Design a protein around this nucleic acid. Structure first.
Ligand SMILES: [Mg+2]
Ligand SMILES: [Mg+2]
Ligand SMILES: [Mg+2]
Ligand SMILES: [Mg+2]
Ligand SMILES: [Mg+2]
Ligand SMILES: [Mg+2]
Ligand SMILES: [Mg+2]
Ligand SMILES: [Mg+2]
Ligand SMILES: [Mg+2]
Length: 101
RNA sequence: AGCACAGUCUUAACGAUGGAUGUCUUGGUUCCUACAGCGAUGAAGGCCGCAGCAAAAUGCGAUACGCAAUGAAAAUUGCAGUGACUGAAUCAUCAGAAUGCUGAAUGUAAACUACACCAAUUCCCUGGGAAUAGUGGUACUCCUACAGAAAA
């Protein structure tokens, strides 16, 4: 195995990878997204292209205290991802929507 | 209220169409003078992004029409905003910090954001306390050391 006298390259700056901010941008408030809130218990978010399904689940949980059981994804033509997030039964989508806007 | 035949051709006066002429020039062209390469510490070129409202060109790189520092030094604007009674609003300089995916492109591939193996990795206080599937390495040829094994 390698036993260098010293590493070739050493970084010392703050991390450059995407964290929870920059991985979720903002909720989408179109007239199709407002309908999902009441009769489907679903919220819609716009996300960075490089996000996974698991990434979005974790980031939404850490940002808004949201428990979810299903995420669906689609890449749009403006360079963004759209996420349809089903909220678990204990959560009511209306109160979560009111808590943030 | 009345009087000129119509067409065709000629000449004056006033207009239409068109963009010559004259004047202008932050642009070309030639000559003279000085200096001179960049790259595995990742170049030239290509793609993708960045502004409160933002298409092109110009400028920048997840700190993204700009940060820090140094010299000047009150304004900058379409609206909204931001600034002193001078590290602040703006201009210049530019040495610190930062610098996406690629490309000789170098783990294996490529009208794929496809697939491997090895080491888990990165922070904060001063041995604790946290976070994260995230980070780095692995082409070919060659030189100097070294390591053991093999033949003789
Ligand atoms: Mg699909
Ligand atoms: Mg006649
Ligand atoms: Mg040379
Ligand atoms: Mg590029
Ligand atoms: Mg000072
Ligand atoms: Mg100053
Ligand atoms: Mg490769
Ligand atoms: Mg194929
Ligand atoms: Mg060869």
């Amino acid at each position: 195995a390698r036993n260098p006298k010293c590493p070739r390259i050493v970084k010392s700056c703050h991390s450059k990878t995407l964290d929870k901010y920059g991985l979720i941008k903002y909720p989408l408030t179109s007239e199709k997204a407002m309908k999902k809130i009441e009769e489907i218990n679903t919220l819609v978010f716009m996300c960075d292209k490089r996000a996974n399904k698991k990434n979005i689940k974790k980031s939404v949980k850490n940002l808004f205290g949201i428990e979810c059981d299903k995420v669906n994804v689609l890449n749009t033509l403006n360079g963004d991802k759209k996420a349809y997030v089903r909220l678990s039964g204990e959560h009511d989508a209306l109160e979560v929507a009111n808590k943030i806007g």
